[PDB]
Short mmCIF file of C-alpha atoms and ligand atoms in Angstrom, two decimals:
data_model
loop_
_atom_site.label_atom_id
_atom_site.label_comp_id
_atom_site.label_asym_id
_atom_site.label_seq_id
_atom_site.Cartn_x
_atom_site.Cartn_y
_atom_site.Cartn_z
CA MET A 21 -19.40 -106.93 -102.22
CA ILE A 22 -22.06 -104.20 -102.17
CA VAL A 23 -21.66 -100.42 -102.03
CA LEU A 24 -24.71 -98.47 -100.83
CA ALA A 25 -25.21 -95.15 -102.62
CA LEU A 26 -26.80 -93.26 -99.74
CA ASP A 27 -28.48 -90.74 -102.02
CA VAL A 28 -31.17 -90.00 -99.45
CA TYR A 29 -30.15 -86.39 -98.79
CA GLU A 30 -32.43 -85.98 -95.79
CA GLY A 31 -30.73 -86.14 -92.48
CA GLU A 32 -31.44 -88.76 -89.97
CA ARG A 33 -33.64 -90.84 -92.58
CA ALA A 34 -30.44 -91.45 -94.55
CA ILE A 35 -28.55 -92.75 -91.51
CA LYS A 36 -31.40 -94.97 -90.40
CA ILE A 37 -31.41 -96.82 -93.73
CA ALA A 38 -27.63 -97.32 -93.71
CA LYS A 39 -27.33 -98.67 -90.17
CA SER A 40 -29.98 -101.33 -90.79
CA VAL A 41 -28.30 -102.72 -93.92
CA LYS A 42 -24.79 -102.59 -92.50
CA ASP A 43 -24.72 -106.40 -92.37
CA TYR A 44 -24.94 -106.76 -96.17
CA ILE A 45 -22.78 -103.91 -97.46
CA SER A 46 -19.02 -103.40 -97.67
CA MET A 47 -18.90 -99.61 -98.06
CA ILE A 48 -21.17 -96.60 -97.99
CA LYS A 49 -20.83 -94.02 -100.78
CA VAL A 50 -21.73 -90.38 -100.07
CA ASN A 51 -21.81 -87.48 -102.53
CA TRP A 52 -21.62 -83.69 -102.47
CA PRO A 53 -25.38 -83.15 -101.96
CA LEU A 54 -25.42 -85.15 -98.71
CA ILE A 55 -22.25 -83.41 -97.55
CA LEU A 56 -23.71 -79.99 -98.37
CA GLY A 57 -27.03 -80.78 -96.73
CA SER A 58 -25.69 -82.39 -93.56
CA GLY A 59 -22.14 -81.09 -93.35
CA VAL A 60 -18.94 -83.07 -93.76
CA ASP A 61 -19.85 -84.49 -90.34
CA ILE A 62 -22.41 -86.86 -91.82
CA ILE A 63 -19.24 -88.79 -92.70
CA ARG A 64 -17.68 -89.42 -89.26
CA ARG A 65 -21.17 -90.30 -88.18
CA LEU A 66 -22.35 -92.56 -91.01
CA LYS A 67 -19.33 -94.48 -89.77
CA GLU A 68 -19.79 -94.74 -86.00
CA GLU A 69 -23.37 -95.85 -86.62
CA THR A 70 -22.87 -98.54 -89.27
CA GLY A 71 -19.25 -99.60 -88.88
CA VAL A 72 -18.88 -99.57 -92.69
CA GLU A 73 -16.05 -98.02 -94.75
CA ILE A 74 -16.98 -94.86 -96.64
CA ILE A 75 -16.37 -93.69 -100.20
CA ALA A 76 -16.64 -89.93 -100.74
CA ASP A 77 -17.92 -89.60 -104.30
CA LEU A 78 -16.50 -86.15 -104.97
CA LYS A 79 -15.04 -86.58 -108.47
CA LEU A 80 -12.23 -84.17 -107.54
CA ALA A 81 -11.11 -82.19 -110.56
CA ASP A 82 -9.18 -79.20 -109.28
CA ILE A 83 -5.54 -78.22 -109.09
CA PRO A 84 -3.22 -80.27 -106.85
CA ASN A 85 -3.17 -78.06 -103.76
CA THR A 86 -6.93 -77.62 -103.73
CA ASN A 87 -7.51 -81.34 -104.37
CA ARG A 88 -5.15 -81.96 -101.43
CA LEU A 89 -7.00 -79.59 -99.10
CA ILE A 90 -10.34 -81.16 -99.93
CA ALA A 91 -8.96 -84.70 -99.50
CA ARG A 92 -7.32 -83.89 -96.17
CA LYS A 93 -10.61 -82.51 -94.89
CA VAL A 94 -12.71 -85.39 -96.25
CA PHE A 95 -10.27 -88.19 -95.36
CA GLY A 96 -9.73 -86.37 -92.08
CA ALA A 97 -13.48 -86.55 -91.54
CA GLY A 98 -13.39 -90.34 -91.82
CA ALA A 99 -13.73 -91.11 -95.53
CA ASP A 100 -11.75 -94.22 -96.52
CA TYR A 101 -11.67 -93.58 -100.30
CA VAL A 102 -12.15 -90.51 -102.47
CA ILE A 103 -13.29 -90.70 -106.09
CA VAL A 104 -11.21 -88.44 -108.35
CA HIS A 105 -11.29 -87.67 -112.08
CA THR A 106 -8.36 -88.69 -114.26
CA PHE A 107 -8.94 -85.87 -116.81
CA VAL A 108 -7.31 -83.12 -114.77
CA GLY A 109 -3.95 -84.91 -114.70
CA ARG A 110 -1.66 -87.11 -112.64
CA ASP A 111 -0.38 -84.45 -110.24
CA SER A 112 -3.98 -83.79 -109.16
CA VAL A 113 -4.64 -87.50 -108.65
CA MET A 114 -1.41 -88.06 -106.73
CA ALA A 115 -2.16 -85.08 -104.46
CA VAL A 116 -5.18 -86.99 -103.17
CA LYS A 117 -3.64 -90.48 -103.19
CA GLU A 118 -0.82 -89.23 -101.01
CA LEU A 119 -3.36 -88.73 -98.19
CA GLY A 120 -5.60 -91.79 -98.67
CA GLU A 121 -7.06 -94.47 -100.96
CA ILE A 122 -8.50 -93.28 -104.28
CA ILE A 123 -10.91 -94.53 -106.95
CA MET A 124 -10.38 -93.06 -110.40
CA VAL A 125 -13.00 -92.12 -112.98
CA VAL A 126 -12.06 -93.59 -116.38
CA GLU A 127 -15.52 -93.71 -118.05
CA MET A 128 -19.01 -92.26 -117.47
CA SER A 129 -22.57 -93.22 -118.41
CA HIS A 130 -24.45 -90.01 -119.21
CA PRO A 131 -24.93 -88.77 -122.81
CA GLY A 132 -22.30 -86.08 -122.27
CA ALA A 133 -19.70 -88.72 -121.43
CA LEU A 134 -19.42 -89.62 -125.11
CA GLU A 135 -18.16 -86.12 -125.93
CA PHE A 136 -14.73 -86.09 -124.25
CA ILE A 137 -14.42 -88.59 -121.41
CA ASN A 138 -15.36 -91.91 -123.03
CA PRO A 139 -13.24 -91.31 -126.14
CA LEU A 140 -10.31 -91.17 -123.68
CA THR A 141 -11.20 -94.19 -121.53
CA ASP A 142 -8.41 -96.34 -123.00
CA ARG A 143 -5.93 -93.63 -122.09
CA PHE A 144 -7.40 -93.13 -118.63
CA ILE A 145 -7.17 -96.86 -117.95
CA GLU A 146 -3.46 -96.71 -118.73
CA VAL A 147 -3.02 -93.79 -116.36
CA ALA A 148 -4.87 -95.88 -113.76
CA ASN A 149 -2.54 -98.78 -114.48
CA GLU A 150 0.52 -96.63 -113.76
CA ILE A 151 -0.89 -94.96 -110.63
CA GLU A 152 -2.43 -98.13 -109.25
CA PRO A 153 -5.34 -96.64 -107.34
CA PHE A 154 -7.44 -98.88 -105.10
CA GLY A 155 -9.92 -99.00 -107.97
CA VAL A 156 -11.75 -97.45 -110.90
CA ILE A 157 -15.44 -96.84 -111.58
CA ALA A 158 -17.02 -98.66 -114.51
CA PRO A 159 -20.67 -98.01 -115.42
CA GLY A 160 -22.23 -101.45 -115.24
CA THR A 161 -25.46 -100.75 -117.11
CA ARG A 162 -23.81 -102.84 -119.83
CA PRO A 163 -21.72 -105.82 -118.60
CA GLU A 164 -19.79 -105.63 -121.86
CA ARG A 165 -18.12 -102.42 -120.64
CA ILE A 166 -17.12 -103.86 -117.28
CA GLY A 167 -15.36 -106.69 -119.11
CA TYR A 168 -13.80 -104.29 -121.58
CA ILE A 169 -12.21 -102.35 -118.76
CA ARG A 170 -11.35 -105.47 -116.80
CA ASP A 171 -9.43 -106.81 -119.81
CA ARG A 172 -7.31 -103.68 -119.92
CA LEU A 173 -6.99 -102.91 -116.20
CA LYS A 174 -4.13 -104.23 -114.07
CA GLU A 175 -5.01 -107.09 -111.70
CA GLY A 176 -5.14 -105.83 -108.17
CA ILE A 177 -6.99 -102.66 -109.17
CA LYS A 178 -10.64 -103.15 -108.25
CA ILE A 179 -13.67 -102.24 -110.33
CA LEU A 180 -16.74 -100.70 -108.69
CA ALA A 181 -19.89 -100.53 -110.82
CA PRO A 182 -22.88 -98.17 -110.45
CA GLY A 183 -25.99 -98.28 -112.64
CA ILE A 184 -26.84 -101.90 -111.95
CA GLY A 185 -30.16 -102.89 -113.49
CA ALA A 186 -33.17 -103.69 -111.31
CA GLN A 187 -33.86 -107.06 -112.99
CA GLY A 188 -33.01 -110.19 -111.04
CA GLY A 189 -29.63 -111.46 -112.21
CA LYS A 190 -28.17 -108.07 -113.23
CA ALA A 191 -26.14 -107.70 -110.01
CA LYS A 192 -24.74 -111.18 -110.44
CA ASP A 193 -23.93 -110.55 -114.09
CA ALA A 194 -22.08 -107.30 -113.32
CA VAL A 195 -19.87 -109.16 -110.83
CA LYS A 196 -19.33 -111.99 -113.29
CA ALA A 197 -18.37 -109.38 -115.91
CA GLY A 198 -15.55 -108.18 -113.64
CA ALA A 199 -17.00 -105.83 -111.02
CA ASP A 200 -15.51 -106.33 -107.56
CA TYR A 201 -18.14 -104.03 -106.06
CA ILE A 202 -21.59 -103.11 -107.35
CA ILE A 203 -22.86 -99.69 -106.33
CA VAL A 204 -26.58 -99.72 -105.62
CA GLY A 205 -28.76 -96.84 -104.48
CA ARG A 206 -32.45 -96.65 -105.40
CA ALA A 207 -33.27 -100.36 -105.53
CA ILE A 208 -32.23 -100.44 -101.87
CA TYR A 209 -32.93 -97.18 -100.01
CA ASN A 210 -36.29 -96.77 -101.78
CA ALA A 211 -37.51 -100.34 -101.38
CA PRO A 212 -40.28 -101.28 -98.92
CA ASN A 213 -37.75 -103.22 -96.83
CA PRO A 214 -34.13 -101.96 -97.19
CA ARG A 215 -32.39 -104.78 -95.31
CA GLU A 216 -34.43 -107.27 -97.32
CA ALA A 217 -33.55 -105.66 -100.65
CA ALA A 218 -29.94 -105.49 -99.51
CA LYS A 219 -30.02 -109.17 -98.55
CA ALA A 220 -31.58 -110.11 -101.88
CA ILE A 221 -28.84 -108.39 -103.85
CA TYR A 222 -26.29 -109.93 -101.49
CA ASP A 223 -27.73 -113.45 -101.87
CA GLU A 224 -28.04 -113.07 -105.63
CA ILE A 225 -24.36 -112.15 -105.86
CA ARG A 226 -23.06 -115.20 -104.00
CA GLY A 227 -25.11 -117.43 -106.31
CA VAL A 228 -27.56 -118.62 -103.64
CA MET B 244 -12.59 -55.41 -111.65
CA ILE B 245 -11.31 -57.60 -108.82
CA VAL B 246 -12.54 -61.04 -107.80
CA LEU B 247 -11.18 -61.85 -104.32
CA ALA B 248 -10.14 -65.53 -104.20
CA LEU B 249 -11.05 -65.99 -100.55
CA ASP B 250 -8.89 -69.06 -99.81
CA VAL B 251 -9.12 -68.59 -96.04
CA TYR B 252 -10.75 -71.75 -94.67
CA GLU B 253 -11.77 -70.38 -91.28
CA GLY B 254 -15.20 -68.87 -91.95
CA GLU B 255 -15.03 -65.96 -89.51
CA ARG B 256 -11.49 -65.07 -90.60
CA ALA B 257 -12.68 -65.14 -94.22
CA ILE B 258 -15.59 -62.80 -93.44
CA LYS B 259 -13.26 -60.46 -91.52
CA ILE B 260 -10.86 -60.18 -94.47
CA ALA B 261 -13.64 -59.96 -97.09
CA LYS B 262 -15.26 -57.10 -95.19
CA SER B 263 -12.05 -55.08 -94.92
CA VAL B 264 -11.63 -55.00 -98.73
CA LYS B 265 -15.28 -55.06 -99.85
CA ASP B 266 -15.19 -51.61 -101.46
CA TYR B 267 -12.29 -52.50 -103.80
CA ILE B 268 -13.66 -55.83 -105.06
CA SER B 269 -16.44 -56.80 -107.46
CA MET B 270 -16.89 -60.43 -106.42
CA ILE B 271 -15.68 -63.09 -104.00
CA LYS B 272 -14.73 -66.58 -105.16
CA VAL B 273 -14.98 -69.46 -102.68
CA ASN B 274 -13.97 -73.10 -103.11
CA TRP B 275 -14.85 -76.40 -101.49
CA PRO B 276 -12.48 -76.13 -98.48
CA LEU B 277 -14.18 -72.99 -97.17
CA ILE B 278 -17.62 -74.51 -97.79
CA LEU B 279 -16.51 -77.69 -96.02
CA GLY B 280 -15.04 -75.81 -93.08
CA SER B 281 -17.85 -73.32 -92.40
CA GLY B 282 -20.80 -74.92 -94.14
CA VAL B 283 -22.39 -73.74 -97.42
CA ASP B 284 -24.28 -71.04 -95.51
CA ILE B 285 -21.01 -69.10 -95.45
CA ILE B 286 -21.95 -67.94 -98.94
CA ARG B 287 -25.03 -66.16 -97.59
CA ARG B 288 -23.05 -64.54 -94.80
CA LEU B 289 -20.25 -63.33 -97.08
CA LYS B 290 -22.86 -61.76 -99.37
CA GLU B 291 -24.70 -60.01 -96.49
CA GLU B 292 -21.45 -58.80 -94.93
CA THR B 293 -19.86 -57.52 -98.13
CA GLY B 294 -22.63 -56.74 -100.60
CA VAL B 295 -20.76 -58.33 -103.50
CA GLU B 296 -21.67 -61.26 -105.74
CA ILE B 297 -20.30 -64.70 -104.98
CA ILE B 298 -18.71 -67.23 -107.31
CA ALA B 299 -18.66 -70.85 -106.11
CA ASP B 300 -15.53 -72.36 -107.68
CA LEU B 301 -16.72 -75.95 -107.44
CA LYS B 302 -15.49 -77.21 -110.85
CA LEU B 303 -18.53 -79.47 -111.10
CA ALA B 304 -17.84 -82.58 -113.18
CA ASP B 305 -20.60 -85.08 -112.45
CA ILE B 306 -23.59 -86.48 -114.37
CA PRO B 307 -26.43 -84.02 -115.16
CA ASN B 308 -28.73 -85.00 -112.29
CA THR B 309 -25.98 -84.74 -109.68
CA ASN B 310 -24.57 -81.53 -111.10
CA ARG B 311 -28.13 -80.14 -110.87
CA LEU B 312 -28.60 -81.25 -107.25
CA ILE B 313 -25.33 -79.60 -106.27
CA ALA B 314 -26.07 -76.42 -108.22
CA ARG B 315 -29.58 -76.16 -106.80
CA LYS B 316 -28.16 -76.26 -103.29
CA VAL B 317 -25.30 -73.86 -103.97
CA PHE B 318 -27.25 -71.28 -105.99
CA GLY B 319 -29.94 -71.70 -103.34
CA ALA B 320 -27.36 -70.93 -100.65
CA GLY B 321 -26.74 -67.61 -102.36
CA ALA B 322 -24.08 -68.29 -105.00
CA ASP B 323 -24.33 -65.99 -108.00
CA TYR B 324 -22.12 -68.07 -110.28
CA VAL B 325 -20.85 -71.63 -110.30
CA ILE B 326 -17.66 -72.73 -112.06
CA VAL B 327 -18.15 -75.92 -114.06
CA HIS B 328 -15.90 -78.16 -116.14
CA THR B 329 -16.51 -78.52 -119.86
CA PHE B 330 -14.93 -81.96 -120.16
CA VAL B 331 -17.87 -83.83 -118.70
CA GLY B 332 -20.05 -82.81 -121.61
CA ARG B 333 -22.71 -80.31 -122.65
CA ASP B 334 -25.57 -81.96 -120.77
CA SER B 335 -23.72 -81.71 -117.47
CA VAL B 336 -22.89 -78.04 -118.14
CA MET B 337 -26.47 -77.19 -119.11
CA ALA B 338 -27.82 -78.96 -116.02
CA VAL B 339 -26.08 -76.25 -114.03
CA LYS B 340 -26.73 -73.36 -116.44
CA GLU B 341 -30.49 -73.93 -116.25
CA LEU B 342 -30.37 -73.06 -112.53
CA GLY B 343 -28.02 -70.09 -112.54
CA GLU B 344 -25.12 -68.29 -114.18
CA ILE B 345 -21.99 -70.30 -114.92
CA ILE B 346 -18.28 -69.88 -115.65
CA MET B 347 -16.64 -72.63 -117.74
CA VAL B 348 -13.20 -74.18 -117.45
CA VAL B 349 -11.60 -74.45 -120.90
CA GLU B 350 -7.93 -74.45 -119.82
CA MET B 351 -5.92 -74.93 -116.60
CA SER B 352 -2.47 -73.86 -115.37
CA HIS B 353 -1.12 -76.70 -113.26
CA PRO B 354 1.30 -79.19 -114.90
CA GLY B 355 -1.34 -81.93 -115.03
CA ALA B 356 -3.39 -79.69 -117.33
CA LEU B 357 -1.02 -80.52 -120.22
CA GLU B 358 -2.08 -84.17 -120.21
CA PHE B 359 -5.72 -83.92 -121.32
CA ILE B 360 -7.41 -80.57 -120.63
CA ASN B 361 -5.17 -78.12 -122.51
CA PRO B 362 -4.88 -80.22 -125.67
CA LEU B 363 -8.67 -79.77 -125.85
CA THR B 364 -8.87 -76.03 -125.08
CA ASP B 365 -9.76 -75.01 -128.67
CA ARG B 366 -12.66 -77.49 -128.66
CA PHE B 367 -13.78 -76.39 -125.19
CA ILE B 368 -13.84 -72.78 -126.33
CA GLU B 369 -16.15 -73.73 -129.21
CA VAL B 370 -18.42 -75.55 -126.77
CA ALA B 371 -18.45 -72.45 -124.58
CA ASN B 372 -19.22 -70.40 -127.71
CA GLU B 373 -22.34 -72.46 -128.29
CA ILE B 374 -23.53 -72.57 -124.67
CA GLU B 375 -22.78 -68.92 -123.98
CA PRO B 376 -21.96 -69.04 -120.23
CA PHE B 377 -21.44 -65.81 -118.26
CA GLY B 378 -17.70 -66.39 -118.66
CA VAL B 379 -14.67 -68.66 -118.86
CA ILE B 380 -11.50 -68.69 -116.82
CA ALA B 381 -8.27 -67.65 -118.54
CA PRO B 382 -4.66 -68.03 -117.26
CA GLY B 383 -3.45 -64.74 -115.81
CA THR B 384 0.08 -66.09 -115.49
CA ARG B 385 0.41 -66.05 -119.28
CA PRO B 386 -1.28 -62.97 -120.77
CA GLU B 387 -0.54 -64.40 -124.21
CA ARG B 388 -3.17 -67.07 -123.51
CA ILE B 389 -5.78 -64.54 -122.38
CA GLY B 390 -5.57 -62.84 -125.78
CA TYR B 391 -5.56 -66.17 -127.63
CA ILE B 392 -8.73 -67.22 -125.80
CA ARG B 393 -10.34 -63.79 -126.14
CA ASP B 394 -9.91 -63.84 -129.92
CA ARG B 395 -11.67 -67.19 -130.26
CA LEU B 396 -14.31 -66.56 -127.62
CA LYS B 397 -17.74 -65.33 -128.69
CA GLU B 398 -18.18 -61.65 -127.99
CA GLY B 399 -20.26 -61.24 -124.87
CA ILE B 400 -18.71 -64.05 -122.86
CA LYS B 401 -16.52 -62.57 -120.10
CA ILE B 402 -13.02 -63.66 -119.15
CA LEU B 403 -11.87 -63.93 -115.54
CA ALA B 404 -8.20 -64.51 -114.90
CA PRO B 405 -6.45 -65.91 -111.78
CA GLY B 406 -2.66 -66.11 -111.46
CA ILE B 407 -2.04 -62.51 -110.40
CA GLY B 408 0.45 -61.82 -107.61
CA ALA B 409 1.61 -65.01 -105.89
CA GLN B 410 1.78 -67.02 -109.14
CA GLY B 411 3.66 -64.19 -110.82
CA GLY B 412 1.02 -62.64 -113.07
CA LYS B 413 0.40 -58.92 -113.39
CA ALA B 414 -3.02 -57.29 -113.16
CA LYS B 415 -2.18 -54.63 -115.76
CA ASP B 416 -1.01 -57.30 -118.21
CA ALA B 417 -4.10 -59.49 -117.81
CA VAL B 418 -6.56 -56.60 -118.32
CA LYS B 419 -4.61 -55.36 -121.35
CA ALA B 420 -4.84 -58.86 -122.83
CA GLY B 421 -8.63 -58.92 -122.47
CA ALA B 422 -9.51 -60.06 -118.96
CA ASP B 423 -12.79 -58.56 -117.72
CA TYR B 424 -12.08 -59.70 -114.16
CA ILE B 425 -8.81 -60.28 -112.30
CA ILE B 426 -8.95 -63.08 -109.71
CA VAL B 427 -6.59 -62.51 -106.79
CA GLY B 428 -6.04 -64.57 -103.66
CA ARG B 429 -2.83 -64.46 -101.60
CA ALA B 430 -1.75 -61.01 -102.83
CA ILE B 431 -4.74 -59.62 -100.94
CA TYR B 432 -5.70 -62.02 -98.15
CA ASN B 433 -2.09 -62.60 -97.04
CA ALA B 434 -1.06 -58.95 -97.46
CA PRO B 435 0.12 -57.32 -94.20
CA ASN B 436 -2.78 -54.94 -94.87
CA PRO B 437 -5.40 -56.49 -97.23
CA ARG B 438 -7.36 -53.29 -97.87
CA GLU B 439 -4.16 -51.54 -98.95
CA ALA B 440 -3.24 -54.45 -101.21
CA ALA B 441 -6.73 -54.50 -102.75
CA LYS B 442 -6.59 -50.72 -103.37
CA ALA B 443 -3.19 -51.01 -105.06
CA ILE B 444 -4.38 -53.66 -107.54
CA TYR B 445 -7.55 -51.60 -107.97
CA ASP B 446 -5.36 -48.60 -108.82
CA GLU B 447 -3.13 -50.64 -111.11
CA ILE B 448 -6.17 -51.85 -113.10
CA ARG B 449 -7.60 -48.31 -113.30
CA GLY B 450 -4.35 -46.83 -114.62
CA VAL B 451 -5.21 -48.95 -117.65
O1 XMP C 256 -19.65 -92.55 -111.54
C1 XMP C 256 -20.83 -92.56 -111.92
N1 XMP C 256 -21.14 -92.29 -113.26
C2 XMP C 256 -22.47 -92.32 -113.69
O2 XMP C 256 -22.74 -92.06 -114.86
C3 XMP C 256 -23.49 -92.61 -112.79
N2 XMP C 256 -24.81 -92.71 -112.91
C4 XMP C 256 -25.32 -93.02 -111.72
N3 XMP C 256 -24.33 -93.12 -110.83
C5 XMP C 256 -24.46 -93.46 -109.40
O3 XMP C 256 -24.77 -94.85 -109.23
C6 XMP C 256 -25.29 -94.99 -107.89
C7 XMP C 256 -26.57 -95.82 -107.96
O4 XMP C 256 -27.46 -95.32 -108.95
P1 XMP C 256 -29.00 -95.78 -108.93
O5 XMP C 256 -29.75 -94.82 -107.87
O6 XMP C 256 -29.64 -95.74 -110.27
O7 XMP C 256 -29.02 -97.26 -108.29
C8 XMP C 256 -25.61 -93.57 -107.41
O8 XMP C 256 -24.54 -93.09 -106.58
C9 XMP C 256 -25.65 -92.78 -108.71
O9 XMP C 256 -25.33 -91.41 -108.45
C10 XMP C 256 -23.19 -92.88 -111.46
N4 XMP C 256 -21.86 -92.85 -111.02
O1 XMP C 257 -3.17 -73.20 -111.96
C1 XMP C 257 -3.01 -72.81 -110.80
N1 XMP C 257 -1.81 -73.06 -110.12
C2 XMP C 257 -1.66 -72.65 -108.79
O2 XMP C 257 -0.60 -72.86 -108.20
C3 XMP C 257 -2.70 -72.01 -108.13
N2 XMP C 257 -2.85 -71.53 -106.90
C4 XMP C 257 -4.07 -71.00 -106.79
N3 XMP C 257 -4.71 -71.14 -107.95
C5 XMP C 257 -6.08 -70.68 -108.29
O3 XMP C 257 -6.10 -69.24 -108.33
C6 XMP C 257 -6.93 -68.76 -107.25
C7 XMP C 257 -6.27 -67.54 -106.62
O4 XMP C 257 -4.87 -67.84 -106.49
P1 XMP C 257 -3.78 -66.88 -105.81
O5 XMP C 257 -3.98 -66.96 -104.22
O6 XMP C 257 -2.42 -67.29 -106.23
O7 XMP C 257 -4.10 -65.36 -106.24
C8 XMP C 257 -6.98 -69.92 -106.26
O8 XMP C 257 -8.19 -69.81 -105.50
C9 XMP C 257 -7.10 -71.09 -107.23
O9 XMP C 257 -8.41 -71.12 -107.82
C10 XMP C 257 -3.90 -71.76 -108.80
N4 XMP C 257 -4.06 -72.15 -110.13
#
């Protein structure tokens, strides 16, 4: 099950790519840049033009009432899931979950992640286990980490993995490692033929 | 020096209120809900209509590249400062700092803050000491914490403190404890007469 990271911040060209690959993806993930550049409306619309669920990658990390306000507006705009940080606390996570499905951040892949976030991943996983969000993000650059998290995460809580390598077999390996969804951006929206690249990743995943 | 927390999500109503108190405030702080409701261009309009600097309280907490994309757009839209989290690491903070002035989060006041953020406040302050942002936010609801932070914060980094009025904090207390700026929302924008409310706090802060 593929998640398209529509990180093509230019208007209509972003929507064109998403509608044409709708057959091979399960969700569409949008971030703050797209939202800022096109307005929160690009959400309602990415929807009624692809028919695919949408994940608003916002990494909410504010106080409860502000997280709530943002969620209400984003869910209200059509988002199906909102990604939220675990670091700011449970009340802030629950404020969003109360209005819609959430995906919690328990680990990150940039150099800075090793400073405070990653040392707390085991603890964040346990928070995730108690809250039972729809899922958690797990950088899949290294399958070992997806399995690490999968071993500690409650069954029923999905794992979505970004940073999937471009080599043939990587997407399949991330799923085998425990990822329920692989989040792919570049390798798809910047490929000569998007639908084709989407189909390739899709076919790879189901082993044939 | 007052920072108006303009938590009025109807763009025109926000401008109307901001304009009526513009001569008693130093800056205007806006968060995601207002940006989502009126579009990020509301920052430009608020600046033109009031003549005061704008702080975008986004609490950025993404990877360096994404934090930079967001900051580029927001500083580009006219923001003078962007509030960023320290927990995501130095690289993510610097990604924003390289594009404009920043204010770092080293401690929060909601209950969830006790779980992971506050236990790390001393370490966050040392990270802020190294990076040297324009300022850090300090809890105005507990003047004892403003002084605690001030003592450990490198000289030159400013302290801005919310929590005055509605949350029970006093402007006079916060300034006495070391706050350079007092962040106030409801006590001014929900006052029967905002300009009068803004003047009063202005007077309170001036009387020492
Ligand atoms: O939660 C996350 N932590 C990370 O460290 C990270 N690095 C990349 N990404 C996101 O992965 C998606 C696909 O990235 P690529 O363009 O390299 O395929 C895109 O949405 C990228 O933004 C991350 N998401
Ligand atoms: O820790 C907190 N607990 C709260 O209940 C709370 N309410 C508001 N805020 C933050 O303070 C800014 C201005 O708030 P006021 O309208 O209460 O003056 C607001 O814009 C927020 O940034 C809060 N922070």
